[PDB]
Amino acid sequence: EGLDFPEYDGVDRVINVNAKNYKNVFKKYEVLALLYHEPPEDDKASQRQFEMEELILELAAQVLEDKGVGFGLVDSEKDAAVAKKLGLTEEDSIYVFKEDEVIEYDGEFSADTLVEFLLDVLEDPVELIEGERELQAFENIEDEIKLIGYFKNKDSEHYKAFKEAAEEFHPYIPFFATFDSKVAKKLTLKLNEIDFYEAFMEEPVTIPDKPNSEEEIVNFVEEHRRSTLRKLKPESMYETWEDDMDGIHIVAFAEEADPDGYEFLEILKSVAQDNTDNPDLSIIWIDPDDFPLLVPYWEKTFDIDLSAPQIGVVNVTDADSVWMEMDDEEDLPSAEELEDWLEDVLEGE
Ligand SMILES: *[C@@H]1O[C@H](CO)[C@@H](O[C@@H]2O[C@H](CO)[C@@H](O)[C@H](O)[C@H]2NC(C)=O)[C@H](O)[C@H]1NC(C)=O
Ligand SMILES: [Ca+2]
Ligand SMILES: [Ca+2]
Ligand SMILES: [Ca+2]
Ligand SMILES: [Ca+2]
Ligand code: NA
Ligand code: NA
């Protein structure tokens, strides 16, 4: 007869954002998530799809109520003028506002993913490294791009530029700073130097021409936005998938928590490292564990067993694909064999 776990309470919290209330809504919340959607269609199916999306927002709204995150709906017809002023263009899409930044969310429309994302948005844009714990944590990041700069202190003109740049990419690309010469030494940073670490790469590339303006940093990050090996992540999956390489993606499935999946991931990292300067190569790593609801679809569509590592090439137009044969009674292919296979497949078609 104990206390129940928290449950969705069925109380409506998602705001109908309109001409009359939108200014007040913005004032009330530090972070605001707005779904820009189309007016109700006549067909039951469309209505049910919208009903689901709105309830997903309700769940997130309940979870994040105490943290001052607000959720709202902007109707492209009824609220056309609000959309105009706020720059809402993308049909049935989520926009996130924090102070003077808009984020055009391009990730999974699930309560889990949205809540984690908005919790990340709430955080300060630069992570400072002081302790050994924090430095170690920084060093252990590999599945995303990361930047680290060394500056005199928070009042350095060059640190402020770095923070402005950080805000432009927040919370997708973590920006770290240190003001401690001992930390800078371990990181091999000179004062005002910023090191850019491509995902899954051991060695950073230093942003040239320090000290760097906000624009120099932003330009550099944009030019280096696509890592040679990048992970499909729920928070960013649509942006990653839509960034195809001339109509195809090389896709690798590997369950990191599995011995074979782990070994395969290490091989993919070697392939990446050996081809890092090749701008025509990007491989998407998908860990099936991250996307339980898509595994049946992938297994059916690609005709593969996702309990084993896989690598293939996928046509983004129609999901046509080809997958490398690997005998699970022998060792996984070496990096050289993977590259050879990719060459064979990509030269022919
Ligand atoms: C990816 O798949 C699509 C088919 O869904 C291919 O597009 C077609 O290509 C053929 C020639 O092979 C054309 O005759 C059709 O008009 C195309 N249909 C379209 C564009 O919808 C496309 O070639 C494939 N990309 C590859 C193989 O790299
Ligand atoms: Ca509205
Ligand atoms: Ca250095
Ligand atoms: Ca400069
Ligand atoms: Ca690279
Ligand atoms: Na992040
Ligand atoms: Na295509």
Report on the architecture of this protein.
It is classed as calcium binding protein. The entry lists the keywords Thioredoxin fold, calcium binding protein. It forms a monomeric assembly. The entry is titled "Molecular Basis for Multiple Ligand Binding of Calsequestrin and Potential Inhibition by Caffeine and Gallocatecin". The protein: Calsequestrin-1. The protein is an alpha/beta fold. It has twelve helices and 15 strands. 37% of the residues lie in helices and 19% in strands. It has three domains: 1-125, Glutaredoxin (3-Layer(aba) Sandwich); 126-227, Glutaredoxin, CATH 3.40.30; 228-349, Glutaredoxin. The longest helix has 20 residues, at 44-63. The chain has helices at 22-28, 44-63, 80-86, 111-122, 132-140, 157-169, 181-187, 214-223, 237-242, 259-274, 295-302, 335-348, and strands spanning 15-16, 31-37, 69-75, 93-98, 101-104, 126-128, 146-150, 175-178, 194-197, 205-206, 229-231, 248-253, 283-286, 310-315, 321-323. Strands 1-3-2-4-5 form a five-stranded mixed beta sheet, sandwiched between helices. Strands 6-8-7-9-10 form a five-stranded mixed beta sheet. A five-stranded mixed beta sheet has the order 11-13-12-14-15, with helices on one face. Helix 2 packs across helix 4 (111-122) and helix 6 runs parallel beside helix 8. It binds a molecule of 2 linked components (NAG-NAG), calcium ion (CA) (4 copies) and sodium ion (2 copies). One sodium ion (NA) binds at residues 247, 315-317.
